[PDB]
Design a binder for this molecule. Structure first.
Ligand code: A1L5P
Ligand code: A1L5P
Lengths: 487, 150, 140
């Protein structure tokens, strides 16, 4: 079985390297995978299943996950063993409904700090075994992510119904205070948000250093997660520089000028800058950058749900189909970009000379041309984008024709992308989802605390293998005979 | 009363299975509704992510925006939902101040939201196509027999 | 046939409970359903069809509906018997077109209060048998 796994990996690498006889090597690798899956299928006792799943620590399951031997991992003989470790130290909870599991997740989300602080004695207690099961680790991580999203939403409170003061008006607690000090000073919730973000950063840095940069880059979703964490870090750094500037201004104003009210003071312009409202900030103000990066980071935070969906029985196949289609989504977006850039350059070249001669500034600049052509895809740009104020019907009609052809081409490319996705759409989906779920499980098999709380007489095996291989040889010969007993 | 009147016409579903031509149509509708629900859940997840992002970005520009679009949770939900069917304009992400960073980030996020909605719609259509496949005939006859025995 | 129906239901419940060997139990339940459908298919007389469709009140049809044995209920041998009760006390109306059935629905919609008040004597009349057929109940 080890020989077949290694040979399957070698043949897959050869299929990648050659590209001439790629089909031959892929067929051979499929032969090796089929042999491994059949040998596993022959098992009829726990001893044999264990001997297959780990040699003389699920070693062979991990190797099959590494080598993309999906039918071996998704086989029921392997899946039952994986569920045995998954639902360890908790037997009744395996048979509970999905609603009970969701209620358990909610309870863990509510009481995560209490169990975290009780973990100082939990290993000596019975509850330590309960929380150290892989399912409870997964539940704790999901509850941690839920709490992080809740913190992100709750930090935006008091603005759900809108702000009460206009951006032109400054409100300060006391006259001696600098307005930018009030706007940039940190409250408790975003301090917790920083602590959590540093927790995930520390974790991700741990796997990055353990696996190496080149190995870590090759996973697109991992670099997406790293980018999301780095965007959080950049936003908080910009906020910190804004706070430092504001507190320097506050120190200056409290040290030097001695007046009851700051309004009557004619402060120096460098110190006077930090008294203006939102409108009179610089375009490159550090707080503007902080807010802009924070919005993107908050949007990208919800993408971490992709680490939890594979565990679910119903949404796992949905994520599998999404992953199946994203590969041609990328290629057809590249084609969209090519066609879009062609038409954008054409429109800009046609209409660049009519900046003040057009009823609508639509294609007069590269920015404007990009904007109108992109928002024409979703129908948020009007047709008067190609109308002049001059009596040049040649230019206007050519713009009309080019814009209509652009719309038709976009529709055609969209339909072709849909059909390509349909073709790429086709129990391989079941084994794919089970492979993903098994990877998720083994990530938690051997991490006990969430990222925020992570800061603190040959042989028995030879006899079993010989028995299983004899069973395989006999079954193969019997199948061949039943195929050709008559001859 | 308006909602009750709208929902009253749903009782036609108790009569269509008796018909030979519309029974299979109701059968196909029931076949697809199961993944309709799951992909609406995915739509809700993506929508809530982008809604929170938009509101957090634009909450501080209540009087500084040409259009009150993402300045409240209600307004952000409204504009992002009606962007799906194309009843919201692109000027929803334009400020009255000279902060091109915020405005450009809003533009990018709104365009990415539209692209993601289209992608999720196409994936839902393909999932429905896959779920679409004389099993339909026996399914409709089973439904009609249940109607008869009632 | 009763044993196969009950075993099919039990195997479906096991398929739900396990989720590891769900495919095995689903295949076994399909085997039981196939056996029941074939035994029904062998019938070549009304007596045999009735004996299959209700044991020693369409009991087995109701059990198959409960257990989602869809090919047994949708089999023509069962469907003809179901149409027999469905179009009871009205034979010519079975062969009428869909437009005639729609016209009957419209007439019943127009005259529903009259037949409802006449139901006080309808069981003693011939029209009571007509309105008490399942098709007329559905139309009403
Ligand atoms: O519509 C947009 C969108 C960008 C993206 C969207 S949407 C989502 C999907 C496509 C990629 C990201 N934007 C942003 C920046 C635009 N923009 C300038 O501000 N200066 C420019 C100079 C050349 C080309 C474009 C210029 C203005 C409006
Ligand atoms: O919309 C259009 C478009 C043309 C085409 C588009 S779009 C792309 C795909 C369809 C074919 C090319 N145009 C151009 C010329 C139109 N046009 C006059 O200017 N005089 C006319 C007399 C009869 C019919 C049309 C007349 C005005 C606006």
């Amino acid at each position: 079985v080890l020989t077949a796994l290694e040979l399957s990996n070698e043949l897959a690498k050869l299929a990648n390297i050659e590209k001439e006889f790629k089909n031959d090597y892929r067929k051979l690798s499929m032969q090796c995978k089929d042999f491994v899956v059949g040998v596993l299928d022959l098992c009829r006792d726990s001893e044999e299943v264990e001997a297959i799943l780990n040699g003389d620590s699920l070693s062979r399951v991990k190797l099959a996950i590494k080598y993309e031997v999906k039918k071996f991992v998704a086989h029921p003989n392997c899946q039952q063993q994986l569920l045995t470790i998954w639902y360890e130290n908790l037997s009744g909870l395996r048979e509970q409904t999905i609603a009970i599991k969701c209620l358990v997740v909610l309870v863990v989300a509510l009481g995560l700090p209490f169990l975290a602080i009780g973990y100082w004695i939990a290993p000596c207690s019975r509850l330590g075994k309960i929380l150290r099961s892989p399912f409870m680790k997964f539940v704790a991580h999901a509850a941690s992510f839920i709490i992080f999203l809740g913190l992100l939403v709750f930090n935006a409170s008091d603005r759900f119904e809108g702000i009460t003061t206009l951006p032109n008006i400054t409100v300060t607690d006391y006259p001696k205070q600098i307005f930018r000090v009030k706007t940039t000073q940190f409250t408790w919730t975003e301090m917790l948000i920083m602590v959590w973000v540093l927790g995930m950063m520390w974790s991700e840095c741990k796997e990055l250093w353990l696996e190496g940069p080149r190995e870590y880059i090759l996973q697109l979703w991992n670099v997406l997660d790293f980018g999301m964490l780095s965007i959080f870090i950049a936003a908080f750094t910009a906020r910190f520089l804004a706070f430092l500037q504001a507190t320097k201004a506050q120190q200056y104003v409290d040290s030097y000028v001695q007046e009851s009210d700051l309004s009557e003071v004619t402060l120096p312009p460098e110190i006077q800058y930090f008294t203006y409202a939102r409108d009179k900030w610089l375009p490159s103000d550090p707080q503007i950058i902080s807010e802009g990066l924070y919005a993107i980071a908050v949007v990208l935070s919800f993408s971490r749900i992709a680490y939890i969906l594979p565990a679910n029985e119903s949404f796992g196949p949905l994520q599998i189909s999404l992953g199946r289609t994203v590969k041609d989504i990328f290629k057809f977006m590249v084609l969209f970009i090519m066609v879009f850039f062609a038409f954008m350059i054409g429109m800009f070249i046609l209409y660049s000379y009519y900046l003040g001669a057009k009823v609508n500034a639509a294609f007069t600049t590269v920015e404007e041309s990009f904007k109108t052509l992109f928002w024409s895809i979703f129908g948020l740009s009007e047709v008067t984008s190609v109308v002049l104020k001059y009596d040049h019907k040649f230019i206007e009609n050519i713009g009309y024709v080019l814009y209509g052809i652009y719309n038709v081409t976009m529709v055609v490319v969209l339909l072709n992308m849909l059909i390509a996705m349909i073709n790429s759409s086709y129990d391989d989906s079941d084994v794919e989802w089970k492979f993903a779920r098994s990877k998720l499980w083994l990530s938690y098999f051997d991490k006990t605390l969430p990222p925020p709380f992570s800061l603190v007489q040959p042989t028995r095996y030879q006899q079993i293998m010989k028995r299983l291989i004899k069973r395989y040889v006999l079954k193969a010969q019997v199948d061949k005979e039943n195929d050709e007993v008559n001859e």
